[PDB]
Amino acid sequence: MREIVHIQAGQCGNQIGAKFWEVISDEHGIDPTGSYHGDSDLQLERINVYYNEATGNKYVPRAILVDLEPGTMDSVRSGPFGQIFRPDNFVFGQSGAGNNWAKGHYTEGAELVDSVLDVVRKESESCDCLQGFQLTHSLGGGTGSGMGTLLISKIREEYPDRIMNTFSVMPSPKVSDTVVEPYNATLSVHQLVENTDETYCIDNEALYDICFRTLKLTTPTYGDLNHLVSATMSGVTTCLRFPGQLNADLRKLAVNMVPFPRLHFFMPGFAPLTSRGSQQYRALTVPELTQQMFDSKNMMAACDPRHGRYLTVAAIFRGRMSMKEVDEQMLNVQNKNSSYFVEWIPNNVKTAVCDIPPRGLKMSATFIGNSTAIQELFKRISEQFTAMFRRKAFLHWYTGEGMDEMEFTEAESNMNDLVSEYQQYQDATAD
């Protein structure tokens, strides 16, 4: 029954992974003990995608929790829903990665990886028909970045015919001052380009700017940043968790969204944007929903969608609304904004509508775009990487772990190639 295995690695991966489970649990009527208490049958129809049914009619997330930082286990277990997670699915080390990709990928991470693979093997074999995997992690640290990409690679060896999907948090010096974050992110992107089928680019630069400029928060905290992350993750997974026709599984989503294998980095967006504690006085109209979710101020990646073209788009509308009005509005943005949509992929914008809205909203909309403007995110990381790399800055922290400088050169070149490929398709014409 199309099961997904969820994996959360590192401090960021576990923080956003926990919020994902707290949020989707509420939507499905599942309390922290695993009991169901809802009104709608749509809540449990596809509960199997993310939850295992344990004895006593309980539901337990098909989630594996990983971190080299031992202290992460306590913070996850102490969360509102820490009780729901399978105890044996918590795999924690004693020595962290110290913001070092090489430690997470090659040394401390490699020491712990077989313990994680044992637990993913067990969840995977228990599946009636496994779809693939979903990894939440950051790219700026050491565990989520290095060990997360090591896990992806090992999982790909045993399950090569399954979808590998990630929620990858991109670093921004606006939220983190760690000097080596561009190194860790470039090394991770190199891995993601080769080994994932679809990746959602949750950019800390866009999240900080949404909180500061749009939500008017003088100093956004990780809670503020993560409110946007969970709201995004709920929206982008709605099609997988509820009964529907379009993009109902990770494979059908990838066939619709990815025309060229490497070009699988999605720009997520949502509407209405809200802060924690902001009440909704009235529901947005379908034209407000459609206009806002396509707005650059609503994107979760710091890229201007009007600086590129949309290869493909998935629009998900949640709540009770007119489908005729939705269709009209979706045709309206494409006909009015025709120059930001590739003309050589006919009917590249697919729209789904789910009757169940998210918490505190009567109407909402989530956007998923595969845009050539995503090169703005990669160019920003590449520039930061190059500034340090030309000075051979901080390399001993990586080569001291056994790494070769040639790996940095290879990763830089691969990400720069990815950027040229987006530009090639942006300039392509339907001759």
């Binding site: 060896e157 001291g400 056994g402 790494m403």
Partner: peptide, 27 residues
């Protein structure tokens, strides 16, 4: 196609063992 992908992934594994051995040479 799957065998080519596996060969590529297994070469990453040989490389990882080389990295681990290289660290050992230093300390």
């Amino acid at each position: 196609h799957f065998a080519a992908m596996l060969e590529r992934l297994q070469e990453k594994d040989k490389h990882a063992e080389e990295v681990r051995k290289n660290k050992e040479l230093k300390e």
